[PDB]
Design an enzyme around this catalytic site. Structure first.
Site, PDB file in Angstrom:
ATOM      1  N   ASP B  25      32.537  24.201  47.003  1.00 23.82           N
ATOM      2  CA  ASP B  25      32.742  24.164  45.548  1.00 23.82           C
ATOM      3  C   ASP B  25      32.878  22.792  44.938  1.00 23.82           C
ATOM      4  O   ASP B  25      33.935  22.175  45.021  1.00 23.82           O
ATOM      5  CB  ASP B  25      34.005  24.993  45.249  1.00 23.82           C
ATOM      6  CG  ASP B  25      34.273  25.196  43.772  1.00 23.82           C
ATOM      7  OD1 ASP B  25      35.301  25.839  43.492  1.00 23.82           O
ATOM      8  OD2 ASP B  25      33.505  24.722  42.892  1.00 23.82           O
ATOM      9  N   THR B  26      31.809  22.329  44.299  1.00 20.00           N
ATOM     10  CA  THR B  26      31.796  21.023  43.652  1.00 20.00           C
ATOM     11  C   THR B  26      32.746  20.968  42.444  1.00 20.00           C
ATOM     12  O   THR B  26      33.098  19.884  41.964  1.00 20.00           O
ATOM     13  CB  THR B  26      30.370  20.681  43.220  1.00 20.00           C
ATOM     14  OG1 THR B  26      29.896  21.629  42.274  1.00 20.00           O
ATOM     15  CG2 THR B  26      29.420  20.675  44.368  1.00 20.00           C
ATOM     16  N   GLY B  27      33.164  22.140  41.964  1.00 22.99           N
ATOM     17  CA  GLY B  27      34.073  22.189  40.834  1.00 22.99           C
ATOM     18  C   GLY B  27      35.547  22.156  41.224  1.00 22.99           C
ATOM     19  O   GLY B  27      36.422  22.204  40.364  1.00 22.99           O
TER      20      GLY B  27
HETATM   21  C1  LIG Z   1      38.427  32.418  43.026  1.00 18.26           C
HETATM   22  C2  LIG Z   1      38.143  30.942  42.798  1.00 18.26           C
HETATM   23  C3  LIG Z   1      36.624  30.688  42.813  1.00 18.26           C
HETATM   24  C4  LIG Z   1      36.461  29.180  42.628  1.00 18.26           C
HETATM   25  C5  LIG Z   1      36.053  28.738  41.240  1.00 18.26           C
HETATM   26  C6  LIG Z   1      36.814  27.451  40.911  1.00 18.26           C
HETATM   27  C7  LIG Z   1      36.011  26.564  39.961  1.00 18.26           C
HETATM   28  O1  LIG Z   1      35.274  27.383  39.048  1.00 18.26           O
HETATM   29  O2  LIG Z   1      35.082  25.829  40.773  1.00 18.26           O
HETATM   30  C8  LIG Z   1      36.928  25.708  39.113  1.00 18.26           C
HETATM   31  C9  LIG Z   1      36.269  24.951  38.000  1.00 18.26           C
HETATM   32  C10 LIG Z   1      37.156  23.959  37.274  1.00 18.26           C
HETATM   33  C11 LIG Z   1      38.198  24.529  36.346  1.00 18.26           C
HETATM   34  C12 LIG Z   1      37.701  25.746  35.580  1.00 18.26           C
HETATM   35  N1  LIG Z   1      37.785  24.838  39.926  1.00 18.26           N
HETATM   36  C13 LIG Z   1      39.079  25.153  40.019  1.00 18.26           C
HETATM   37  O3  LIG Z   1      39.473  26.187  39.462  1.00 18.26           O
HETATM   38  C14 LIG Z   1      39.941  24.189  40.822  1.00 18.26           C
HETATM   39  N2  LIG Z   1      40.751  23.392  39.904  1.00 18.26           N
HETATM   40  C15 LIG Z   1      40.605  22.064  39.916  1.00 18.26           C
HETATM   41  O4  LIG Z   1      39.868  21.449  40.687  1.00 18.26           O
HETATM   42  C16 LIG Z   1      41.418  21.288  38.899  1.00 18.26           C
HETATM   43  N3  LIG Z   1      42.171  22.137  37.979  1.00 18.26           N
HETATM   44  C17 LIG Z   1      41.984  21.985  36.656  1.00 18.26           C
HETATM   45  C18 LIG Z   1      42.572  23.085  35.775  1.00 18.26           C
HETATM   46  O5  LIG Z   1      41.381  21.025  36.189  1.00 18.26           O
HETATM   47  C19 LIG Z   1      42.401  20.391  39.660  1.00 18.26           C
HETATM   48  C20 LIG Z   1      42.954  19.427  38.584  1.00 18.26           C
HETATM   49  O6  LIG Z   1      43.463  21.214  40.142  1.00 18.26           O
HETATM   50  C21 LIG Z   1      40.829  24.847  41.840  1.00 18.26           C
HETATM   51  C22 LIG Z   1      40.073  25.696  42.849  1.00 18.26           C
HETATM   52  C23 LIG Z   1      41.938  23.995  42.397  1.00 18.26           C
HETATM   53  C24 LIG Z   1      41.459  22.694  43.045  1.00 18.26           C
HETATM   54  C25 LIG Z   1      36.075  29.799  40.165  1.00 18.26           C
HETATM   55  O7  LIG Z   1      36.994  30.060  39.369  1.00 18.26           O
HETATM   56  N4  LIG Z   1      34.938  30.512  40.033  1.00 18.26           N
HETATM   57  C26 LIG Z   1      34.912  31.561  38.960  1.00 18.26           C
HETATM   58  C27 LIG Z   1      34.258  30.883  37.744  1.00 18.26           C
HETATM   59  C28 LIG Z   1      34.189  31.778  36.515  1.00 18.26           C
HETATM   60  C29 LIG Z   1      32.808  32.449  36.444  1.00 18.26           C
HETATM   61  N5  LIG Z   1      32.786  33.734  36.093  1.00 18.26           N
HETATM   62  O8  LIG Z   1      31.824  31.795  36.781  1.00 18.26           O
HETATM   63  C30 LIG Z   1      34.023  32.685  39.465  1.00 18.26           C
HETATM   64  O9  LIG Z   1      32.891  32.485  39.945  1.00 18.26           O
HETATM   65  N6  LIG Z   1      34.477  33.928  39.284  1.00 18.26           N
HETATM   66  C31 LIG Z   1      33.552  35.023  39.613  1.00 18.26           C
HETATM   67  C32 LIG Z   1      33.913  35.691  40.927  1.00 18.26           C
HETATM   68  C33 LIG Z   1      34.927  34.886  41.741  1.00 18.26           C
HETATM   69  C34 LIG Z   1      35.055  35.500  43.139  1.00 18.26           C
HETATM   70  N7  LIG Z   1      35.785  36.767  43.102  1.00 18.26           N
HETATM   71  C35 LIG Z   1      37.107  36.962  42.977  1.00 18.26           C
HETATM   72  N8  LIG Z   1      37.757  37.768  43.840  1.00 18.26           N
HETATM   73  N9  LIG Z   1      37.805  36.372  41.991  1.00 18.26           N
HETATM   74  C36 LIG Z   1      33.484  36.017  38.460  1.00 18.26           C
HETATM   75  N10 LIG Z   1      32.302  36.597  38.291  1.00 18.26           N
HETATM   76  O10 LIG Z   1      34.454  36.252  37.751  1.00 18.26           O
END
Ligand SMILES: CCCC[C@H](CC(O)(O)[C@H](CCCC)NC(=O)[C@@H](NC(=O)[C@@H](NC(C)=O)[C@@H](C)O)[C@@H](C)CC)C(=O)N[C@@H](CCC(N)=O)C(=O)N[C@@H](CCCNC(=N)N)C(N)=O
Lengths: 99, 99
Positions: B25-27
């Site tokens: 995850d680049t994010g």
């Molecule tokens: C469960 C975690 C999956 C990882 C990613 C994380 C990320 O999108 O890369 C985000 C993007 C940046 C802030 C929004 N990164 C983060 O959330 C990361 N945050 C950060 O790097 C920074 N935080 C902040 C707030 O800046 C750091 C300062 O702490 C953390 C993981 C902690 C290091 C994420 O949230 N993906 C969501 C993006 C929203 C979207 N819909 O695209 C996703 O794909 N969700 C899918 C499914 C996820 C998998 N399933 C599940 N069980 N949740 C969905 N369709 O809802």
């Protein structure tokens, strides 16, 4: 271009005639930008992140320029800490992860 | 390897002698792994993203094998829905975003 990750991969995007900063996010299925006025009717969608779920507004076939490359696809609008460009649009610009 | 983003970029990792699937995850600034036992002392930390913040335990100097590539860095352990490999370790394996 080739982007290293020592720093957050932020890029400039152009949406609705405005320039905004966004994060290239391979960890996101979709593309989400902060509250803004977009054209058309929206549909409801629920997305989940590290801290739980949120409700966003879904708009289709939106034109968006990402670091100079034009893409046309689905954009979600809602309370995200930062604009994120997800896989749905990353694949449109032909982005890959290499190592 | 060159990884396209038509699907989630998941890879096999090895940590604490355990095999696990993780998302490149680049994010993500940091690396967050699901609840598991790691050696050493840790510090509490709060990390956030979409949906809010969660409490994790920070372990430093942890060696992790990412798809064959050995790397070392800080690893956060907490209630994450999916194992995330963030930039702190992506840089160590020479991963880049190309388009
Ligand atoms: C469960 C975690 C999956 C990882 C990613 C994380 C990320 O999108 O890369 C985000 C993007 C940046 C802030 C929004 N990164 C983060 O959330 C990361 N945050 C950060 O790097 C920074 N935080 C902040 C707030 O800046 C750091 C300062 O702490 C953390 C993981 C902690 C290091 C994420 O949230 N993906 C969501 C993006 C929203 C979207 N819909 O695209 C996703 O794909 N969700 C899918 C499914 C996820 C998998 N399933 C599940 N069980 N949740 C969905 N369709 O809802």
């Amino acid at each position: 271009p080739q982007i290293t990750l020592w720093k957050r991969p932020l890029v400039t995007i152009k949406i609705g005639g405005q320039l905004k900063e966004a994060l290239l996010d391979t960890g996101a299925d979709d593309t989400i930008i902060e509250e803004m006025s977009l054209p058309g009717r929206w549909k409801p969608k629920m997305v989940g992140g590290i801290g739980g779920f949120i409700k966003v507004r879904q708009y289709d076939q939106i034109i968006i320029e990402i670091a100079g490359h034009k893409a046309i696809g689905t954009v979600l609008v809602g309370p995200t800490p930062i604009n994120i460009i997800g896989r749905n649009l990353l694949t449109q610009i032909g982005a890959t992860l290499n190592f």
